[PDB]
Design an enzyme around this catalytic site. Structure first.
Site, PDB file in Angstrom:
ATOM      1  N   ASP A  58      18.845 117.916  32.034  1.00  0.00           N
ATOM      2  CA  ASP A  58      18.973 116.503  31.676  1.00  0.00           C
ATOM      3  C   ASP A  58      20.101 116.252  30.674  1.00  0.00           C
ATOM      4  O   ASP A  58      20.036 115.322  29.868  1.00  0.00           O
ATOM      5  CB  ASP A  58      17.641 115.997  31.111  1.00  0.00           C
ATOM      6  CG  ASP A  58      17.554 114.481  31.071  1.00  0.00           C
ATOM      7  OD1 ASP A  58      18.220 113.809  31.893  1.00  0.00           O
ATOM      8  OD2 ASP A  58      16.810 113.954  30.217  1.00  0.00           O
ATOM      9  N   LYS A  99      25.927 115.652  33.295  1.00  0.00           N
ATOM     10  CA  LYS A  99      25.654 115.836  34.722  1.00  0.00           C
ATOM     11  C   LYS A  99      26.616 116.827  35.378  1.00  0.00           C
ATOM     12  O   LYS A  99      26.239 117.528  36.319  1.00  0.00           O
ATOM     13  CB  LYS A  99      25.656 114.487  35.452  1.00  0.00           C
ATOM     14  CG  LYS A  99      24.730 113.424  34.824  1.00  0.00           C
ATOM     15  CD  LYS A  99      23.348 113.978  34.442  1.00  0.00           C
ATOM     16  CE  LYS A  99      22.608 113.049  33.500  1.00  0.00           C
ATOM     17  NZ  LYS A  99      21.487 113.752  32.805  1.00  0.00           N
ATOM     18  N   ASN A 101      18.263 112.716  37.290  1.00  0.00           N
ATOM     19  CA  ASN A 101      19.486 111.949  37.563  1.00  0.00           C
ATOM     20  C   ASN A 101      20.345 112.478  38.699  1.00  0.00           C
ATOM     21  O   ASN A 101      21.568 112.342  38.670  1.00  0.00           O
ATOM     22  CB  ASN A 101      20.352 111.856  36.305  1.00  0.00           C
ATOM     23  CG  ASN A 101      19.591 111.348  35.119  1.00  0.00           C
ATOM     24  OD1 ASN A 101      19.472 112.036  34.101  1.00  0.00           O
ATOM     25  ND2 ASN A 101      19.051 110.142  35.238  1.00  0.00           N
ATOM     26  N   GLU A 156      15.142 105.232  34.746  1.00  0.00           N
ATOM     27  CA  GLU A 156      14.306 104.813  33.627  1.00  0.00           C
ATOM     28  C   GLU A 156      14.498 103.333  33.286  1.00  0.00           C
ATOM     29  O   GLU A 156      15.627 102.866  33.101  1.00  0.00           O
ATOM     30  CB  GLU A 156      14.571 105.679  32.391  1.00  0.00           C
ATOM     31  CG  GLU A 156      16.050 105.823  32.006  1.00  0.00           C
ATOM     32  CD  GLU A 156      16.685 107.105  32.518  1.00  0.00           C
ATOM     33  OE1 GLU A 156      16.364 107.539  33.643  1.00  0.00           O
ATOM     34  OE2 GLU A 156      17.512 107.680  31.785  1.00  0.00           O
TER      35      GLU A 156
HETATM   36  O1  LIG Z   1      23.974 111.137  30.350  1.00  0.00           O
HETATM   37  C1  LIG Z   1      22.761 111.216  30.447  1.00  0.00           C
HETATM   38  N1  LIG Z   1      22.063 112.169  29.837  1.00  0.00           N
HETATM   39  C2  LIG Z   1      22.585 113.233  28.995  1.00  0.00           C
HETATM   40  C3  LIG Z   1      22.043 112.860  27.622  1.00  0.00           C
HETATM   41  C4  LIG Z   1      22.281 113.971  26.638  1.00  0.00           C
HETATM   42  N2  LIG Z   1      23.479 114.529  26.370  1.00  0.00           N
HETATM   43  C5  LIG Z   1      23.312 115.486  25.438  1.00  0.00           C
HETATM   44  C6  LIG Z   1      24.411 116.348  24.867  1.00  0.00           C
HETATM   45  C7  LIG Z   1      24.273 117.763  25.383  1.00  0.00           C
HETATM   46  C8  LIG Z   1      25.361 118.396  25.968  1.00  0.00           C
HETATM   47  C9  LIG Z   1      25.239 119.696  26.441  1.00  0.00           C
HETATM   48  C10 LIG Z   1      24.030 120.370  26.329  1.00  0.00           C
HETATM   49  C11 LIG Z   1      22.939 119.739  25.744  1.00  0.00           C
HETATM   50  C12 LIG Z   1      23.062 118.436  25.274  1.00  0.00           C
HETATM   51  N3  LIG Z   1      22.004 115.534  25.112  1.00  0.00           N
HETATM   52  N4  LIG Z   1      21.341 114.567  25.876  1.00  0.00           N
HETATM   53  C13 LIG Z   1      22.017 110.192  31.249  1.00  0.00           C
HETATM   54  C14 LIG Z   1      22.655 109.015  31.625  1.00  0.00           C
HETATM   55  C15 LIG Z   1      21.965 108.058  32.358  1.00  0.00           C
HETATM   56  C16 LIG Z   1      22.629 106.799  32.775  1.00  0.00           C
HETATM   57  C17 LIG Z   1      23.658 106.264  32.012  1.00  0.00           C
HETATM   58  C18 LIG Z   1      24.268 105.084  32.414  1.00  0.00           C
HETATM   59  C19 LIG Z   1      23.845 104.446  33.573  1.00  0.00           C
HETATM   60  F1  LIG Z   1      24.431 103.303  33.967  1.00  0.00           F
HETATM   61  C20 LIG Z   1      22.816 104.981  34.334  1.00  0.00           C
HETATM   62  C21 LIG Z   1      22.205 106.160  33.934  1.00  0.00           C
HETATM   63  C22 LIG Z   1      20.638 108.269  32.709  1.00  0.00           C
HETATM   64  C23 LIG Z   1      20.010 109.441  32.321  1.00  0.00           C
HETATM   65  O2  LIG Z   1      18.708 109.663  32.658  1.00  0.00           O
HETATM   66  C24 LIG Z   1      20.694 110.398  31.596  1.00  0.00           C
HETATM   67  O3  LIG Z   1      20.042 111.542  31.240  1.00  0.00           O
HETATM   68 CL   LIG Z   2      10.375 103.872  33.768  1.00  0.00          CL
HETATM   69 CL   LIG Z   3      14.369 112.286  27.780  1.00  0.00          CL
HETATM   70 MG   LIG Z   4      18.200 111.805  32.351  1.00  0.00          MG
END
Ligand SMILES: O=C(NCCc1nc(Cc2ccccc2)n[nH]1)c1cc(-c2ccc(F)cc2)cc(O)c1O
Ligand SMILES: [Cl-]
Ligand SMILES: [Cl-]
Ligand SMILES: [Mg+2]
Length: 214
Positions: free
Chosen positions: A140, A143, A169, A198
């Site tokens: 998660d 991507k 996703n 979500e």
């Molecule tokens: O980017 C997402 N997630 C990554 C979040 C994240 N990045 C980190 C940095 C990290 C880096 C490396 C290794 C560990 C962590 N930690 N957590 C994400 C985006 C969307 C979403 C956004 C815009 C839209 F229009 C539609 C959907 C939906 C989602 O469910 C998501 O998970």
């Molecule tokens: Cl939901």
């Molecule tokens: Cl989450």
């Molecule tokens: Mg997600």
């Protein structure tokens, strides 16, 4: 200052019960439905996650990407006594929110936050963190990192026959290379769980990919 993530944490602290993970999840979902959207796995996909966790009862789970700790709380609350979750978070501000979220939920003993890039941390899991093999992996994070990190997990000997990969996703924002790879590989048995993004009336889904060995 403050950030959306700080506002979510504050809302949980003031609208949930300490030591009650269910109330924490409900508070986050309420905030993100009524006030500000946030990239938590959410309740729709969360219910599918719950079903998977309950089926496999994993003893050791790796999460890639913690964000605010929603999925960490979601998974950790259903783990059996003594079972453990490791969650990798590159963003230090996210890591701080996640730790505080876990603390409030009373799940701090079950979950350990690993700080850094997943590509740097994954090779350290065996020697530094005393991991043999993983029972489940929840993807998660970025991507475009799903596929390279999956290949790195295999390289490092962290997958075993039956290891469950569960990827958020796979439709939105989407992970086309990961999806094509696991579905085309004889080393994975794949299942798609169609759901919704979500807090939105937008189609998304989870992919389960069970590792079959080399
Ligand atoms: O980017 C997402 N997630 C990554 C979040 C994240 N990045 C980190 C940095 C990290 C880096 C490396 C290794 C560990 C962590 N930690 N957590 C994400 C985006 C969307 C979403 C956004 C815009 C839209 F229009 C539609 C959907 C939906 C989602 O469910 C998501 O998970
Ligand atoms: Cl939901
Ligand atoms: Cl989450
Ligand atoms: Mg997600």
């Amino acid at each position: 200052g403050d950030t959306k993530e700080q506002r979510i944490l504050r809302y949980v602290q003031q609208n949930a019960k300490p030591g009650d993970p269910q109330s924490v999840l409900e508070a986050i979902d309420t905030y993100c439905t009524q006030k500000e959207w946030a990239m938590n796995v959410g309740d729709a996909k969360g219910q599918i996650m719950d079903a998977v966790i309950r089926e496999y009862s994993p003893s050791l789970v790796l999460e890639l990407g913690a964000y605010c700790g929603y999925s960490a709380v979601r998974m950790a609350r259903l783990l059996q006594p003594g079972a453990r979750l490791l969650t990798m978070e590159m963003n230090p501000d996210y890591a701080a929110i996640t730790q505080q979220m876990l603390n409030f939920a009373g799940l701090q003993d079950k979950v350990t936050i690993l700080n850094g890039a997943s590509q740097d941390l994954i090779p350290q899991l065996k020697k530094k963190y005393d991991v043999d093999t993983l029972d489940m992996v929840f993807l998660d994070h970025w991507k475009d990192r799903y596929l390279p990190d999956t290949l790195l997990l295999e390289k490092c000997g962290l997958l075993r026959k039956g290891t469950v990969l569960l990827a958020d996703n796979v439709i939105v924002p989407g992970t086309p290379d990961f999806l094509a790879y696991v579905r085309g590989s004889s080393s994975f048995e794949c299942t798609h769980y169609s759901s919704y993004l979500e807090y939105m009336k937008v189609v998304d889904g989870l992919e389960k990919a069970i590792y079959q060995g080399p």
